[PDB]
Amino acid sequence: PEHSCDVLIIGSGAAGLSLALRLADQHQVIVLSKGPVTEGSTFYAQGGIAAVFDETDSIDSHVEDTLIAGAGICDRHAVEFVASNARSCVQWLIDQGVLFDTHIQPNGEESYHLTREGGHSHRRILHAADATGREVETTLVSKALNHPNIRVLERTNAVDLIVSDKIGLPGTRRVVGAWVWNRNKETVETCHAKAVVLATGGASKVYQYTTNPDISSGDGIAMAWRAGCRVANLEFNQFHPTALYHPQARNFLLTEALRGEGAYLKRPDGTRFMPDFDERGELAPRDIVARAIDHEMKRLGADCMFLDISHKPADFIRQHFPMIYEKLLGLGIDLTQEPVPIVPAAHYTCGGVMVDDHGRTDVEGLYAIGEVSYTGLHGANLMASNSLLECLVYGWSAAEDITRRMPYAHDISTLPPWDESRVENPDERVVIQHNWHELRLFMWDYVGIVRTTKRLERALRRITMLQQEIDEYYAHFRVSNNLLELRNLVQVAELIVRCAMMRKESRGLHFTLDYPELLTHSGPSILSP
Ligand SMILES: Cc1cc2nc3c(=O)[nH]c(=O)nc-3n(C[C@H](O)[C@H](O)[C@H](O)COP(=O)(O)OP(=O)(O)OC[C@H]3O[C@@H](n4cnc5c(N)ncnc54)[C@H](O)[C@@H]3O)c2cc1C
Numbered sequence: 278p279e280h281s282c283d284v285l286i287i288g289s290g291a292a293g294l295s296l297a298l299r300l301a302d303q304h305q306v307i308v309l310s311k312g313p314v315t316e317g318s319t320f321y322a323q324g325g326i327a328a329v330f331d332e333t334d335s336i337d338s339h340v341e342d343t344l345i346a347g348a349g350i351c352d353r354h355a356v357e358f359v360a361s362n363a364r365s366c367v368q369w370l371i372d373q374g375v376l377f378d379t380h381i382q383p384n385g386e387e388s389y390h391l392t393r394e395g396g397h398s399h400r401r402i403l404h405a406a407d408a409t410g411r412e413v414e415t416t417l418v419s420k421a422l423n424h425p426n427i428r429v430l431e432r433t434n435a436v437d438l439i440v441s442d443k444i445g446l447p448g449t450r451r452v453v454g455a456w457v458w459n460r461n462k463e464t465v466e467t468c469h470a471k472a473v474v475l476a477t478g479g480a481s482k483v484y485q486y487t488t489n490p491d492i493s494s495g496d497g498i499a500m501a502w503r504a505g506c507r508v509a510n511l512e513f514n515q516f517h518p519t520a521l522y523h524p525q526a527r528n529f530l531l532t533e534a535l536r537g538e539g540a541y542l543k544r545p546d547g548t549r550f551m552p553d554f555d556e557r558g559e560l561a562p563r564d565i566v567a568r569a570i571d572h573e574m575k576r577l578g579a580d581c582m583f584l585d586i587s588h589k590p591a592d593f594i595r596q597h598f599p600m601i602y603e604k605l606l607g608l609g610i611d612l613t614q615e616p617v618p619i620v621p622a623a624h625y626t627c628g629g630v631m632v633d634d635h636g637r638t639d640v641e642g643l644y645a646i647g648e649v650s651y652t653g654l655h656g657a658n659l660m661a662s663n664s665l666l667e668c669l670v671y672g673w674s675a676a677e678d679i680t681r682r683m684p685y686a687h688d689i690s691t692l693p694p695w696d697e698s699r700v701e702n703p704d705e706r707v708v709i710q711h712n713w714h715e716l717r718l719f720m721w722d723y724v725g726i727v728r729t730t731k732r733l734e735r736a737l738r739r740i741t742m743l744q745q746e747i748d749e750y751y752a753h754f755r756v757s758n759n760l761l762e763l764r765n766l767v768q769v770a771e772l773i774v775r776c777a778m779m780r781k782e783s784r785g786l787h788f789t790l791d792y793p794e795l796l797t798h799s800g801p802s803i804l805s806p
Pocket residue numbers: 287288289290291292293309310311312314316317318319320321322323324325326327409433434435436476477478479488489490492496497530624625646647648649661662663664665666668
């Protein structure tokens with residue numbers, strides 16, 4: 278028909294492309310990508326992927342580090358599980374063409390050089406200079422493009438998934454495709470499939486400041502919800518503690534790896550502030566550091582803080598942080614000689630769509646893996662470099678489950694075409710622009726790093742106004758990117774806030790002045806549609 282395949286993968290970053298390869302030798306796969314095929318967080322990951330490779334290190338530490346960085350609510354099977362398959366998955370990646378920095382020199386022979394970021398307690402982060410992402414994305418991309426059974430559809434923005442009991446199909450609720458805005462030809466076309474996989478990324482763009490590409494609008498979280506999936510833990514959004522505070526800093530992240538190799542966190546006056554907050558100093562986990570930086574900006578009334586690796590050999594630095602060095606230089610900053618100004622910005626969505634060990638969601642035929650998901654691995658706070666890591670493990674387990682299921686799968690039926698609504702309004706379009714800004718601004722102030730019930734009230738009320746306001750002014754409006762994206766950001770913002778109002782405690786990334794203490798029995802926050 279319009280478009281047909283066996284497995285439709287929505288998203289083409291680490292989660293999707295990698296899942297796509299595993300499926301390719303025996304399935305017909307179509308990977309969508311809302312912008313160019315490589316635009317996505319993955320392409321921008323710097324510091325690398327955690328796995329366990331050193332004789333000295335052990336799966337045990339990597340788990341325990343994760344259970345700690347997760348502030349008590351990581352789900353254990355989930356952490357071990359995943360702790361227990363990296364390299365293999367990491368190895369798989371390598372067997373695909375990925376080149377991680379080789380050492381040269383244990384004191385006998387060559388290996389994979391390894392960094393560390395906060396919460397780690399052994400060195401096990403494979404990287405490629407200070408720009409792992411480019412190497413992974415670039416490669417999975419190239420493999421998927423040169424494979425007969427995977428069709429890559431760029432500039433294709435999914436709008437919603439097709440659920441059988443919603444289009445009068447009979448049988449249990451299950452996904453059977455998605456309607457997609459074909460950016461280039463400006464229609465919504467229909468894509469049929471036997472399995473749909475959400476690999477869309479996260480949502481940090483709901484926040485005014487973020488380390489993210491402009492794609493990270495939470496679309497798949499929203500799609501899944503509109504389709505019936507429960508979602509969880511969306512109050513746990515991570516604000517990476519060191520993003521560049523420079524006017525031309527579109528949105529840039531200085532890797533945690535910097536701290537991992539000696540970088541320092543300083544006050545505008547030169548002093549190191551972390552030890553006022555946590556023995557773990559520069560390498561404590563992110564909810565705690567981000568909070569400290571936030572605390573100090575407020576107390577001091579300062580625009581910012583600084584990241585300094587000067588104390589270190591120009592050469593070390595330039596060989597281990599090429600990309601960041603090349604690029605702070607264009608902004609007339611010398612990572613080699615000066616402290617860089619940095620601020621905490623929205624970086625990763627710890628929560629998302631509930632899914633089990635094979636990436637399955639609550640709706641048959643619908644999977645989700647990667648940042649768009651919630652597995653239990655990150656509890657209340659991700660540990661650095663577990664993210665790409667989750668993307669890979671779940672692309673595997675999911676490939677396995679699907680593969681086993683495809684042979685018994687129902688035959689690809691015809692579907693209703695999307696009802697292109699078609700009204701226009703040059704001015705109201707602009708308004709859709711005001712609202713996006715509006716949202717991102719109030720979520721920063723009202724569902725940010727420090728929180729209170731009363732601010733969460735303000736946030737929900739404003740989101741409610743936005744949704745009422747949207748049904749009313751943009752239910753008949755012709756599809757477009759901005760409108761698609763705004764419906765999604767607003768939807769996801771609701772789940773975030775509602776999840777945040779449920780937690781009567783301060784844990785991991787959720788900190789609220791009205792409950793500074795810990796409950797003794799916690800768990801995830803769960804919302805169902
Ligand atoms: C600056 C930065 C650095 C990072 N560095 C690291 C690191 O070194 N190590 C690590 O583990 N993690 C790192 N992360 C976190 C980790 O990078 C991400 O969580 C991971 O890349 C998420 O990948 P993904 O496959 O799940 O989604 P993404 O790579 O973000 O891609 C999602 C894909 O979904 C597609 N998509 C989204 N919405 C739609 C839609 N509506 N319709 C159709 N397609 C859609 C997008 O087009 C995109 O192709 C970093 C993140 C950032 C932002």
